[PDB]
Amino acid sequence: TRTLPPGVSDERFDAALQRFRDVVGDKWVLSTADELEAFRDPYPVGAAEANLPSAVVSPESTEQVQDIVRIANEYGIPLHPVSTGKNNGYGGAAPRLSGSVIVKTGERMNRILEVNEKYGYALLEPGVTYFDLYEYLQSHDSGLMLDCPDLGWGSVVGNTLDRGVGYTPYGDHFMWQTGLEVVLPQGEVMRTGMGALPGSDAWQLFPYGFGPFPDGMFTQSNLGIVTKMGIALMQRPPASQSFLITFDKEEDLEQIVDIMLPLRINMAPLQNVPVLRNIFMDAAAVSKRTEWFDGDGPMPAEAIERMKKDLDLGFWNFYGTLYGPPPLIEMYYGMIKEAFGKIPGARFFTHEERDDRGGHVLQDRHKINNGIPSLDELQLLDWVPNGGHIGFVPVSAPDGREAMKQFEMVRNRANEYNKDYMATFTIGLREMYHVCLFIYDTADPEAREEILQMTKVLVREAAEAGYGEYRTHNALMDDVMATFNWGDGALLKFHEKIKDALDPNGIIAPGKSGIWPQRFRGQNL
Amino acid sequence: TRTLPPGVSDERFDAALQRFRDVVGDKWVLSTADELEAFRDPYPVGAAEANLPSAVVSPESTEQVQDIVRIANEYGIPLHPVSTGKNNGYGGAAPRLSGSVIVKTGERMNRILEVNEKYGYALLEPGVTYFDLYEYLQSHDSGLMLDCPDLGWGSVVGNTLDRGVGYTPYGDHFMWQTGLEVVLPQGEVMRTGMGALPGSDAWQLFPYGFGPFPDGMFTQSNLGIVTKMGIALMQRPPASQSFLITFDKEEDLEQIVDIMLPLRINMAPLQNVPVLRNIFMDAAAVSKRTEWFDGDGPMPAEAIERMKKDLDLGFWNFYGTLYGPPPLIEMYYGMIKEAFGKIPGARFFTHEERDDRGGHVLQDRHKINNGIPSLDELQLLDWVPNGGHIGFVPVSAPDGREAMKQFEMVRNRANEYNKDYMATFTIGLREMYHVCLFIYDTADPEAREEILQMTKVLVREAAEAGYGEYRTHNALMDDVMATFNWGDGALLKFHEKIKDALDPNGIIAPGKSGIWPQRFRGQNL
């Protein structure tokens, strides 16, 4: 059946579509079933269809965004704004609320507005991808570098707006975001920070401006449609070196984390974001599951040992990058070798020593950690046929016993739902992430349903242990928000009040982060 | 005449005071004229009285804060929450709206709730001063250090909540703030971040939690009364060295700023916040104005030269601190000497090489930049009789020509009012602050009115040139917010909608940051 916005008739939707065409042009409104297939979640969760877009609208300008938002208010049409819509693992471009119209800002709002070499920043529209920005920097012989997530095809803006992350010293994208322009839910436009001061040259220099600081309220949010965003860009160091440390035993995790923290908290000698990937992650990056095991159920111990030996990797594989003059790199690498060398069985490899099959991940991290965008990690999805993933990422204290607890409890449930445990432990400065990716056959309804049910259990069990997630998929947003319920659900009640005040007609991305406007609240959508 | 809350009769206010006494205890409510004198602005602006408190209430707990807020909602009494109320330069403890009750959270909510050595943080109530936290760290032989503003007697929490700043690598207090507990305007209590996840140990480890990030909305804000706040603490480095660079000429500012930026933007070799103080700042720290000039009008050129020669200082005096092992400090100091040594007349001094009166400021900066709180800068107020100051701090790009423009325009305007130009230029990473202090005789109604009228002009002239202030005094909040008026005042309209949604009775700090609730809007208060 044709996908319609909730409460909106075929005829009223057709009227709204024509109003959108009048704003953006006929070819920039998509509403046929075949056209919309490409905007469904590529990695669907649950057997049942969910998260169905009713249309896609591609505006060319801020003023067009304002007009789209005004039309949506008049007709009661929910809008799901995206930049590039590559939020794969968390829903892709698909809306939380079925029937919503996707506003694909990045299709035509794709300009690099400014790159400032001296102060080190960019001012971007949503359609600038990491590859686009890297191409600009390279072609202009920039002394700046970007900070990219594992895949380069997403949006510098869109990624930041979901509090996405990379792995250089500038890996906290929201931290380095500086200034934004946003269309609020009834169509008015606002600039944050020094952008609110007409004529200021400091929109991308000083984030806070004057008065209450609002920019974080537009991340993981449904309070507007962002049209411009600034971000600081780090100067490229004179040299860099990447390294891999393999650790042979599953149980080494405890000691690895307990050494990682003191080496990272002062930003030296671990200068970049530490990443500790398990053998399943690294094998999936370079091989298919059937190279190792073609049977039913969890991978047996003998097959895991074959992965390790054939790829010359450990159960846990640490990747880091060092920056600066050669003497500084040498000093820091010596400190890291001395410290992690206390773990029996640790072995060390630099990016210049190892470029075999098993070292493909090291070479990829060397690119990523130097702001060179990549799509090599798409090979993960070849682990099984029709591969897709969901991301499950609890936050905790950077404590080795806490890490072991999380490793074991997540792997136990993964085994029970017939999913491989693919995980990375990372530390920011003082916090730990358990970055779990679950890869499955997206064409199998049973596997889809298992992913949904397993991850609901993982969310609950993590919360029972005092862990909450930093980001989640459409299918889990209500459940994750429900875990943040100190003080009888005070946080969500606060967000709801703000949502209803800014969005009285309940238009923007209803249900994002579990935050529903009044007209949809308590309706099991 | 007795100061009353707007619209509240003397009899109703007396009843409300008894209600407050029943919550906090009779001795913890102040309401006599003499009791309230200490809570008036110590450094008043304008000849006419303004910013008069009606009472002070000192709660002992979050629950008492909630009860106070509920009473205030019932009676329509505005509340001005403070921590220690030492916001001198910006109004002291005094409320923006005359007649408001000051809620002095820090008098009795003064506990250090946790200092965590391994992860490097503190969880604090509002009454913990920098001196208190320093005493704790020293007495427990901590390996951590704090980051303090110039004066140590304020609140780690209160300072952060006005986006105050210090001078170590952790000088951006809000950046390092991690988690808070707040009583919202109708008395509900909420925890931000991982504090919303019951049982999480990461409240002070991971700032953002899940969903829209709100904590910045409680800074320079009137959206609640904060009762707990976390902040990260840096590890103390193994050694440190401070230095002064004297620059002889007024016009050296251009070249100094243009060298400061490249040496700071990568956080090395300028590892701490660079501060470039003019001769008036450094003289005022150690001497009275009449030592140099007792006449009418601006300070003559001959007297400026006498200050320089007597103190062995420049017109512009750069102060910095280096940290790390001795060899690292030596390397960075050599880089700094090489770079700034390109300016003719530059002279260099370490903190071990100046024991003269002129070196007093270097000794003070060496304390502050090492997280050792001080009150030595109170001597600034002895520049003139009954001395007080107001702070005027525009934000701009870290460009030497922009610095010269700001220097000249501010000094020109100050000269019209016979007020000395006391300024510091600082850089964060990519932004510049023009930290102006105007010192005046607080007992002289003509001086008070000059300061008001001068600073209103300075705000306007700065905005005309594209500079906006990062923070301001009660007297200037309406004028400063009016400068951030891109998009026909879009920013303020947004803040107003949020204020009215969270504070329907218009209770919390009306007019803070120029943000007035509906009941007071457009009333010239």
Ligand SMILES: *Cc1cc2c(cc1C)nc1c(=O)[nH]c(=O)nc-1n2C[C@H](O)[C@H](O)[C@H](O)COP(=O)(O)OP(=O)(O)OC[C@H]1O[C@@H](n2cnc3c(N)ncnc32)[C@H](O)[C@@H]1O
């Ligand atoms: C499959 C996968 C994913 C992945 C990854 C590795 C694999 C194998 N590694 C990641 C990593 O290292 N870091 C990270 O942050 N993400 C990683 N991912 C996930 C994903 O690939 C990336 O995050 C990707 O960059 C996200 O997609 P994109 O950049 O296209 O962003 P988007 O879909 O457009 O927007 C995301 C959400 O943000 C809000 N949004 C976006 N634009 C707007 C505008 N203009 N206004 C308002 N809100 C906006 C929406 O909520 C949107 O859904």
Ligand SMILES: *Cc1cc2c(cc1C)nc1c(=O)[nH]c(=O)nc-1n2C[C@H](O)[C@H](O)[C@H](O)COP(=O)(O)OP(=O)(O)OC[C@H]1O[C@@H](n2cnc3c(N)ncnc32)[C@H](O)[C@@H]1O
């Ligand atoms: C005179 C002077 C001042 C000064 C300075 C040098 C001189 C000579 N150097 C400073 C510096 O280096 N850095 C800086 O940030 N400030 C500097 N100052 C100004 C002042 O001394 C300090 O900022 C001082 O620490 C501020 O006072 P305090 O720390 O006592 O903070 P407060 O008055 O209690 O609160 C300030 C405002 O914040 C909001 N607030 C505070 N507590 C709450 C709670 N609990 N809930 C909600 N809002 C709260 C209020 O708006 C309050 O007015």
Ligand SMILES: [Cl-]
């Ligand atoms: Cl609006």
Ligand SMILES: [Cl-]
């Ligand atoms: Cl409330």
